[PDB]
Design a protein around this ligand. Structure first.
Ligand SMILES: NC(=O)c1ccc[n+]([C@@H]2O[C@H](COP(=O)([O-])OP(=O)(O)OC[C@H]3O[C@@H](n4cnc5c(N)ncnc54)[C@H](OP(=O)(O)O)[C@@H]3O)[C@@H](O)[C@H]2O)c1
Ligand SMILES: O=c1c(O)c(-c2cc(O)c(O)c(O)c2)oc2cc(O)cc(O)c12
Ligand SMILES: O=c1c(O)c(-c2cc(O)c(O)c(O)c2)oc2cc(O)cc(O)c12
Length: 320
């Protein structure tokens, strides 16, 4: 059958296409710029890309642009998201894009299910942290707007887009699933540095401005995540939002896993404002596992796959 994947040039999108191709789907991968060799080379190099992968130019800002790509699809995987005035440059596009792709799905008449990649930023952005988050939990928009932490506009954009999308999904018998990853970490097929690896390997690179997100962190392996995407597309019992997250630990525990694996790097021992009495916040993937889905990887796997791919590509120095 034929499935569309938006944001195929990205870290999650390209890995998902790979997996969908390996499982024997015919894939329509969407990109904003098909002439960009540094993004399409990696797509066109995937197994079965010659016979089962087609490329489609589309942009979330352009109303109707996903129309033709989606027409004749049985499934859509909406992974793409827009990345000075955030309210209009990021927020509105994301919501409109989202609706735009369900409109395009309905216009298509052939889509049986739409799977949206959401964000942990839709779940736990509030001032007080619960010890365990689940799918009934939603982020606090007034806290986002009033405090404006790093990435606030992506918290707000994805929360609003997913809620706007659920409205539409119930209205129009559009059968909609959402998957909520926490920090996605793993090897990758792209030659640019995955954004979430800038955050995950921050203990190594010393990028302080990324610590807050891993102070109390949650993690999922890219391959577990893509599988979860396909599983949920297929498994017709699937309903609702699904958290996809395999590990949680505070930054001390992360950094401590890393030091032991990577003596080679200058991985600090203590972090500002972080007691060992800091509780870890877990994202419960019970709803997903109760369906039957199983996680195949470990925190160690994630960061090994990551650091190995990053050095191989010259994105990380081999030591400090
Ligand atoms: N990685 C994580 O830790 C993580 C965790 C939770 C949720 N997510 C969600 O996962 C998705 C994938 O993120 P990722 O980390 O794979 O990011 P990425 O590698 O930066 O990929 C993002 C994709 O978005 C596409 N895109 C950006 N602007 C677009 C636009 N205006 N129209 C159409 N496509 C556009 C980019 O395509 P081009 O640049 O080719 O145009 C790129 O393919 C995002 O929705 C994000 O919110 C990621
Ligand atoms: O670069 C960043 C980023 O992209 C996101 C992000 C968060 C979400 O919830 C999303 O849904 C999303 O698309 C992006 O958060 C961040 C949080 C930080 O503390 C620091 C960062 O550098 C980022
Ligand atoms: O999409 C992203 C995302 O959801 C989160 C995130 C992870 C968590 O574990 C949370 O608890 C949380 O609230 C947000 O971080 C990110 C960091 C990046 O560099 C880039 C991203 O795209 C995300």
């Amino acid at each position: 059958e034929t499935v569309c994947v938006t944001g195929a040039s990205g870290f999650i999108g390209s890995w998902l296409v790979m997996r969908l191709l390996e499982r024997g789907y015919t894939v329509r991968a969407t990109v904003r710029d098909p002439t960009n060799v540094k993004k399409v080379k990696h797509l066109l190099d995937l197994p079965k890309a010659e016979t089962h992968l087609t490329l489609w130019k589309a942009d979330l800002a352009d109303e109707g642009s996903f129309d033709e790509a989606i027409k004749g699809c049985t499934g859509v995987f909406h992974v793409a998201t827009p990345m000075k005035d955030p309210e209009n440059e990021v927020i509105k596009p994301t919501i409109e894009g989202m609706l735009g792709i369900m409109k395009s799905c309905a216009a298509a008449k052939t889509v049986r299910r739409l799977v949206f990649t959401s964000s942990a930023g839709t779940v736990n952005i509030q001032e007080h942290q619960l010890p365990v988050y689940d799918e009934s939990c939603w982020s606090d928009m007034e806290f986002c707007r009033a405090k404006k932490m790093t990435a606030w506009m992506y918290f707000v954009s994805k929360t609003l887009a997913e809620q706007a999308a659920w409205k539409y999904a119930k209205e129009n018998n559009i059968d909609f699933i959402t998957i909520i990853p926490t920090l996605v970490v793993g090897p990758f097929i792209m030659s640019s540095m995955p954004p979430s690896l800038i955050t995950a390997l921050s203990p190594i690179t010393g990028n302080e401005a990324h610590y807050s997100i891993i102070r109390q962190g949650q993690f999922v392996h890219l391959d577990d995540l893509c599988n979860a995407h396909i599983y949920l597309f297929e498994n017709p019992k699937a309903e609702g939002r699904y958290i996809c997250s395999s590990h949680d630990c505070i930054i001390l525990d992360l950094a401590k896993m890393l030091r032991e694996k990577y003596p080679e790097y200058n991985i600090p021992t203590e972090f500002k404002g972080v007691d060992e009495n800091l509780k870890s916040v877990c994202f419960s993937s019970k709803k997903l596992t109760d369906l039957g889905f199983e996680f195949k990887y470990s925190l160690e796997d994630m960061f090994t796959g990551a650091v190995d791919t990053c050095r191989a590509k010259g994105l990380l120095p081999p030591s400090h």
